[PDB]
């Protein structure tokens, strides 16, 4: 008759009445995003989202969440990428991310598109998700920088990539974290994230308060002394950065 909440270190959670084995299995289980307000509510099996409908957590009473479903028939399911498939719904945006960021021309000279905040937020705020296909460090390291513009290390075994043509928002917009540009004085960091649709990925989290329409940047963190193993635009920027220092 009790309700359990299981928080990941990133601040998202699963919440529901667990079954006899103590598992998050039922028709009224929910994933709640780190705002503690946006939720995906519905059928889960042992914590895996089978059919989560978009909802708002309106209140909690005696620990029990009370949700209101959002209009539309916005449904989501566990859909972890493979080495060759990025998403079964590449054009279906994440509903939490879509309230917080948008893509526009970067303010950084010659840097293409960038990722911007839609609203003012405080420090430590998860803004965007970095999802992609899952490939090995051997594949990435053994190949040309021209092909490695979007590669993000996930852990010691996996690199997340957004290969052509999925680097265009008209072909892939389920997540947008690959759109953040590099800065040596960034306002955001990459952090681990466990996502109910994307699985184990990284997110973009603010280090400080950010205003609406501010460009979000992260330090790409290439090895500076393996000179730097990095693209030339970064090597140039590193020298300039080191100079002002």
């Amino acid at each position: 008759h009790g309700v359990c909440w299981i928080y990941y270190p990133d601040g998202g959670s699963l919440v529901g009445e667990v079954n006899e084995d103590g598992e998050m299995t039922g028709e009224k289980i929910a994933y709640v995003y780190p705002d503690e307000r946006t939720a995906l509510y519905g059928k889960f099996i042992d914590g895996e989202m089978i059919e989560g409908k978009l909802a708002t957590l309106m209140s909690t009473e005696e620990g029990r969440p009370h949700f209101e479903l959002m209009p539309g028939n916005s449904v989501y399911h566990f859909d972890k990428s493979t080495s060759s498939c990025i998403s079964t719904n590449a054009l279906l945006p994440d509903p939490y991310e879509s309230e917080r960021v948008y893509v526009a021309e970067s303010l950084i000279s010659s840097a293409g598109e960038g990722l911007f905040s839609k609203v003012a937020v405080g420090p430590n705020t998860v803004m965007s998700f970095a999802n992609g296909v899952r490939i090995t460090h051997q594949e990435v390291d053994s190949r040309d920088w021209a092909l490695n513009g979007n590669t993000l290390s996930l852990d010691e075994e996996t690199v997340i990539d957004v290969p052509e043509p999925y680097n265009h928002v008209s072909k892939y917009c389920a997540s947008l974290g690959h759109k953040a540009n590099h800065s040596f004085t960034p306002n955001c960091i990459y952090d681990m994230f466990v996502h109910p649709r994307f699985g184990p990925i990284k997110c973009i989290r603010t280090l400080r308060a950010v205003e609406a329409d501010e460009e979000l940047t992260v330090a790409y963190g290439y090895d500076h002394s393996p000179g730097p193993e990095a693209p030339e635009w970064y090597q140039v920027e590193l020298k300039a950065f080191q100079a002002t220092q």
Binding site: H137, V140, D141, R143, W145, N148, T151, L152, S153, E156, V159, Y190, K202, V218, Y220, G221, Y222, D223, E229
Partner: peptide, 8 residues
């Protein structure tokens, strides 16, 4: 490595 954010 030719990827972002590796733990060295």
């Amino acid at each position: 490595s030719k990827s972002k954010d590796r733990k060295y």
